[PDB]
Design a protein around this ligand. Sequence first.
Ligand SMILES: Nc1ncnc2c1ncn2[C@@H]1O[C@H](COP(=O)(O)OP(=O)(O)O)[C@@H](O)[C@H]1O
Ligand SMILES: Nc1ncnc2c1ncn2[C@@H]1O[C@H](COP(=O)(O)OP(=O)(O)O)[C@@H](O)[C@H]1O
Ligand SMILES: Nc1ncnc2c1ncn2[C@@H]1O[C@H](COP(=O)(O)OP(=O)(O)O)[C@@H](O)[C@H]1O
Ligand SMILES: [Mg+2]
Ligand SMILES: [Mg+2]
Ligand SMILES: [Mg+2]
Ligand SMILES: [Mg+2]
Lengths: 212, 52, 48, 532, 528, 76, 364
Amino acid sequence: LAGEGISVNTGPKGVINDWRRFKQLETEQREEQCREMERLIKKLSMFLQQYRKQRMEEMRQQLHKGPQFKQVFEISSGEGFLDMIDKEQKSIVIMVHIYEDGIPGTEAMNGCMICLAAEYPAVKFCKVKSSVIGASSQFTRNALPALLIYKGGELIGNFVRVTDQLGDDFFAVDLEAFLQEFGLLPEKEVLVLTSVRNSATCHSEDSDLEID
Amino acid sequence: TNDGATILKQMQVLHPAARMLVELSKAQDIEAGDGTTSVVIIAGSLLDSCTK
Amino acid sequence: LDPMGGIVMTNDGNAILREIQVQHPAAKSMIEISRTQDEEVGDGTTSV
Amino acid sequence: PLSVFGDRSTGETIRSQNVMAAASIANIVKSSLGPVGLDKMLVDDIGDVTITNDGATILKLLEVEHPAAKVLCELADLQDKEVGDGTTSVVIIAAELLKNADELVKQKIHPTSVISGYRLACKEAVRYINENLIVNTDELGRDCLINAAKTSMSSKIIGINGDFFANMVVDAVLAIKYTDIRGQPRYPVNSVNILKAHGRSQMESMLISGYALNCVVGSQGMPKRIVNAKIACLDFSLQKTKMKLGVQVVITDPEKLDQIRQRESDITKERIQKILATGANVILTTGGIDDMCLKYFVEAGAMAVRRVLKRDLKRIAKASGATILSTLANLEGEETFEAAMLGQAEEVVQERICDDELILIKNTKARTSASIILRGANDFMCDEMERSLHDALCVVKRVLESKSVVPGGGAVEAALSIYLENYATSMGSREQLAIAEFARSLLVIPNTLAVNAAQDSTDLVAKLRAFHNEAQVNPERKNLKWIGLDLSNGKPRDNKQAGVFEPTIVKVKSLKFATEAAITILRIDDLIKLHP
Amino acid sequence: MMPTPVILLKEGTDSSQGIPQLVSNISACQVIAEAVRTTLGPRGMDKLIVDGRGKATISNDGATILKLLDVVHPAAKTLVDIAKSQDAEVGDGTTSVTLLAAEFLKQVKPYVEEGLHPQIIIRAFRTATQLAVNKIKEIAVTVKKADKVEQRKLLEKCAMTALSSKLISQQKAFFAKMVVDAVMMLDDLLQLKMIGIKKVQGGALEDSQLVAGVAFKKTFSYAGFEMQPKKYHNPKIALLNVELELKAEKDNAEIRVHTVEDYQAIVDAEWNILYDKLEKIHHSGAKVVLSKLPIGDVATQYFADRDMFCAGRVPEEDLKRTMMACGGSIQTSVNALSADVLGRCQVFEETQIGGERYNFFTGCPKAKTCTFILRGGAEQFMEETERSLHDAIMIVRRAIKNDSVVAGGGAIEMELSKYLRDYSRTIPGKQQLLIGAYAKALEIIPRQLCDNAGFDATNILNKLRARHAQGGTWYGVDINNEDIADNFEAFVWEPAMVRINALTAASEAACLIVSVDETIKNPRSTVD
Amino acid sequence: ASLSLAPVNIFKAGADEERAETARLTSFIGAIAIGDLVKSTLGPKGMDKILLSSGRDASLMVTNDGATILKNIGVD
Amino acid sequence: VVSQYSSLLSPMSVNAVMKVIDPATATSVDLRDIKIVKKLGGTIDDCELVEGLVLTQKVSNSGITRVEKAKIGLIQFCLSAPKTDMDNQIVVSDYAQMDRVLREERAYILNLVKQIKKTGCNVLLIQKSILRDALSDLALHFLNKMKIMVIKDIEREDIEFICKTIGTKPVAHIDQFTADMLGSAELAEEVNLNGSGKLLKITGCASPGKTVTIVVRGSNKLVIEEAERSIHDALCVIRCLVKKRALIAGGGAPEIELALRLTEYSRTLSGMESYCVRAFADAMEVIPSTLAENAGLNPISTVTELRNRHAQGEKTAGINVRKGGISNILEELVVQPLLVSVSALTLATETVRSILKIDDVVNT
Ligand SMILES: Nc1ncnc2c1ncn2[C@@H]1O[C@H](COP(=O)(O)OP(=O)(O)O)[C@@H](O)[C@H]1O
Ligand SMILES: Nc1ncnc2c1ncn2[C@@H]1O[C@H](COP(=O)(O)OP(=O)(O)O)[C@@H](O)[C@H]1O
Ligand SMILES: Nc1ncnc2c1ncn2[C@@H]1O[C@H](COP(=O)(O)OP(=O)(O)O)[C@@H](O)[C@H]1O
Ligand SMILES: [Mg+2]
Ligand SMILES: [Mg+2]
Ligand SMILES: [Mg+2]
Ligand SMILES: [Mg+2]
């Protein structure tokens, strides 16, 4: 065992294509690994006072009005999550819900997001199972109900165990008030019921022009 | 594209000799503006003869 | 059974069809038909 | 040896791959061509539904990965932008040209010879169309416009109702006519505001002899109808006055604060009073209006509409004779509003359309405008109606601008095929084969039309070709150039007498774009796809 | 589509129907055809295919290439099946069948895309194929003289034409003469098992020889074999089916004795049984002993003492070929070894060929069998030589059956195309288009020849079409001269049945492919 | 060119090839290492070695014999 | 790909090069004087050689287009509220002060616009500004009321080109804005490209500069990029013809002549260098082989015919693709400038010599 100063010549050069072959795959994998690591472990290791307006907010929150009521976006691929959070304009807030089927504390959250989506069309409420993301065993077993919030490509919401501060009977009013306490929900805008639609496309206007 | 310089610089060749030929095509484009394919073909043929 | 937790008891066609979530887009077209009939005249949803 | 971090395809492999991609794109939309064509119904995997027949829309919604298929997609988009009709036809023609050219290449014909033959064939086809197949609309009257609109709306959801829709389209187009400098009457389509609202049947669609706004009055105290409207178009918000960033209020004596705060709204009060003192009845602004100025308008019994779209406001100002005012400042440095800045209309109302309200500016003076309110069964049907209506409007604009039309129903393609087949014998030796293949490829349109009707395509196209050959051989049988296809009965028919017409620009632009795309794709013989 | 809570077929069933699936079938047939496209003609190229185990098979035969390809497309398997059928019935033209079938499908694809009913296409193919077969039978050249010299020359020319597409094409005259001689030495049935094919590594192709007799490798000599003489000048061969070694009398046999005298008697009885068999063989006058069953060391030494030759465990077909060449009979018992059942050859010798020992039985004057000993530098070399010789042998056998030939180089197909086009120009017109498409599709082989040779196929095809139209029947592609020539006068001959079967099989495959309109694939069970 | 340093790969996975430089270098290193290991046990004042078997038996022997030293070593 | 449109493009490129240079006493061509503008839509047959300038920026002052006898002015300051370089604030402690602030801002903007208008200017180009508002709505309204076209968001790096084309002199302060610093043009209009976009064209300039703009059209983006590259190739060819004004035949004739003459030269030498020069000639013989290939001809026969014809004395014998064989190419009009072959040979030889002086590779 001598001549340790090899100064290898072309072996790594001659296998550069095969080396990049799995280096790019590893980079792609650790992309989502680092995106998820920002959530795992760190938080897994651990009579106006009576809301007079809560009831009335509940009744006029039942203002679906338009076509149907839609549903939260369901993500079935981790790469789908990564290339939807990476894309899309960063001006508006992205909220993500983590869940596992059967566990209590999920249907109420989904209903709250469904009701809130109508209130704030700007927000991008979506849900995804913890299984597809690649969550850790502890996070899957006892940290599933969490409201992941992203804005500007970086985390803005640091919420896990939402049932701890919301219970299991929380309504959309409760979630809206709780989020507005931390100033994360975009402010509401005045809206009116269009007939159905007006615009078709935007291009060269070629408007009216009276000429001699 | 059909331009030799554009074809050569549009693909990562990953081999040092190929990279120097790409630089050759760029230089020929700078001085002349065409013949970028011809100069690379000539260099390749010259080195092929150098083999024997 | 409203997905938000409420209960809607009715025999009005428009409410029943509105509370149903469907995947086949022809069903979506039919539901939109129900909504249009309800908004235009306010009756005849089940009939249409 | 190359050591390139990517994949390489060379020779017949990449050519066949490109041809397969183009053929797949063509086969996607081949079933939506001609009156016997049927619509498609897309889903955007979030529940959104789009029922359509327009080829450009279908190819725009779909997500495409292959480069050649992309090339055909932007070909469709360009054909829509420059003409507005014949999108599916040009896509199909381009793909068929590519397929036949690739067959010729596989026969060991050099691609450059095929490209030269295609260029010659395209030039000669355009020349023959312009010299033999054009029909002038001067001697036809309004019937040619009506028939062109009906032909455009065939294969669309408004095909059967053409007898009414064509009249509406022609009236709308003729309402917005203007002659510019050098005396060329231009027809600015896209100035016809298309409004959709589900509800009553299709036949209840209204053509407004004026302008339609998708907005309502800002306050419920204002009147909902004014007979003799003096429209005031503004391009600035009417709110409480706020100082700019460079201006800051610092108070050292408390006695001035109340005066400052009062002036903060009295400025807008004075502006509103200046605007209203001229007799204005309708006030449209692109910006917002707060509650104070809304009450100010309420007390005067005048309209006030906020958040009006800029394009709609510009159209209203041009039609009514009003002038947009982004600010109140004459050339003397003062703040004034002349009465001459007011537009006029015979009525302004807020009608109810299916539990919703919209503002109609009826019969504006100094210019005639138009707008169409489409009534359907749901949102999807209204969208398809709007797309078909836009197609018909563009077709009518093309016909009225350039007064030449050509017979439809595949007559032009058959005549071109016969002429080019007879003409290829007089040019070159291999571009002869290229021109022959161009002529053969041009026959895909009548073949697709016949196939979509579940009729005998072979026999029908054979009869059409025989008719056109007789037309081109016998000098005294030149009236057979108009013999197209009648899809309802599956027999050849004189389309010029029947009333099937198209703008010549549609065929010319489609041929040119398809030839250019076929040439562009045919140049590739080697593909390098780098790993991302 | 709706969920239909109880679905009709098993979950995972795949169905495709209508024009798109037929177009897909045509495309798959094209894909299959282009795999063997470049193997056709004297400028053909071999193809290398590696299986899962890593063994490589280098071949130019179309049927072999298609078999080695693991085709799973239901429509594409038809081309492989018709290639196998052409190989079985004829033995040559396994690429022409695939090219013709795929070209038929490609030519009628545009009419399928236009909604034409496939039954019309099928009827058109049937009519065109019947007419083409009748024309081939009419214009095929035959000689009503039965001259032996003329027949030999015809067979040699046919063998040369068959062989002028493989790697042994350089020595095609040599191998054609060898094949013709070997086939003429077959008696009446032309059994292929009566022609031995021995492949020995090392040596040039011209070193390969045909033995007018029988030859086989030395088979596991026992001790004392090197003491036997290895050359005889008029040996009598004793073909036996006998185990000549000391062994138990029978599997169920059991010996019970109660005296040492009986023990010695039993031992001597076993030895005397073996020695009686050996002496019965020796007294017959034979000098060469061959046995299908093993011959032991005791028998080997016994024969070596008598200057005799023995070889046990001879392969059964080798023994049968020896019987046919020498004229003896395989004997399961040695009790009656008369002169009738003893073979006879002029010379027997054991020589070394490329590091192996081979036994040679030459000088047989009444032999009805042969043995090809092929030489080459690699195992695939001998295998491909054997495949080429098999093609030539099948062609020569078919020509022996009937000496009716047509010119090669695509001349027959250009003549057929001209005839079919002329016929199609006199029918109503729905069938005329399809028959003209068939006639144009018949032009694929000369075009493929020109493309493989690096020609310009269009100019050669135009010249051929003009020559056939203006008069001239056997004008095909002259590969060497970059032009066209009278292929009959150039001795590019081909048995008529080759083209007849090629056309028949291609038409049948095309009709079967066109007829099908729906493809249903039930799910794989037990994927494991 | 070279059997190993060629764009196409001609070996099974795990096969190797050392040309003149590397072959001579490895041969010389191995031979010199063996010589230096077995030496220092030479002559009247040579010393012995301890051979610890790494197997289950863990057999132990001390020897001055060069042949026995070289026999019981795993050499690559 | 533009071989079919060559009959249009080649005179266009020749004219473009001859426009931006002095035909006499010129030793180089600065191709930055020939701006290429790519607009999607149409066909390559729609390519144009506008002699003024084309601006992709839209006209802010909508409603007024196609000014005639234009007096274009280019400014580098901002038409907005006053703002000093150092940080500034306005303090208000009285309502009269509020009214005076608004009135004085209006008066300042109006005075700026009036001073611009007094010079006879009717087209205004405004350089792009970031920190300060380049064009306030009030200033735009005043300019509109005085019938002046306003075109804002002019890039900083286009100022030199615009000034060289129109003849305007940039104005960075209203004090120096006079009539003599304006550019006179025959017409300045905005033209729509049949729905594919709007271009702003200023055609016809008194005392025009040495700049031209080429407008490239095409059905899709890829063909437009390739057309731009091909046009640049033509311009570079004309530039190579400008310096070292020498011409040679194309068609592989120089390569085959090099092969033959260098074979003779090697035969005149001795030793290993004879073999090296023979190899050099054989390597130069590759371009005629590649040209005979890709055209369907037999490379060996065509190359041998070239060599034999050149040995006979035919210096201009080259590969002919139109006739499918070999013939004189000067009658085929296939010529290229000398400083293409010379440059390629010199650069290739230098690169080969550089590569040959390498014997090891070290990673890093
Ligand atoms: N019409 C022609 N006939 C024969 N040869 C030509 C013709 N046009 C160009 N060539 C040759 O093709 C060669 C390649 O030119 P081109 O592909 O345009 O640029 P590059 O020299 O960079 O490859 C040139 O050396 C020229 O001699
Ligand atoms: N009444 C008719 N009879 C026969 N053919 C028609 C009739 N109306 C339209 N066609 C043909 O059907 C085709 C339909 O074209 P279409 O698909 O609407 O164009 P696009 O590609 O813009 O969608 C046209 O090419 C026209 O020639
Ligand atoms: N000397 C030759 N000249 C021209 N063509 C030939 C010659 N020899 C064989 N052919 C052609 O080759 C074709 C057969 O090629 P081959 O590969 O031997 O068999 P297969 O038909 O199985 O491909 C025949 O059609 C024949 O016409
Ligand atoms: Mg060039
Ligand atoms: Mg009711
Ligand atoms: Mg249409
Ligand atoms: Mg054969």
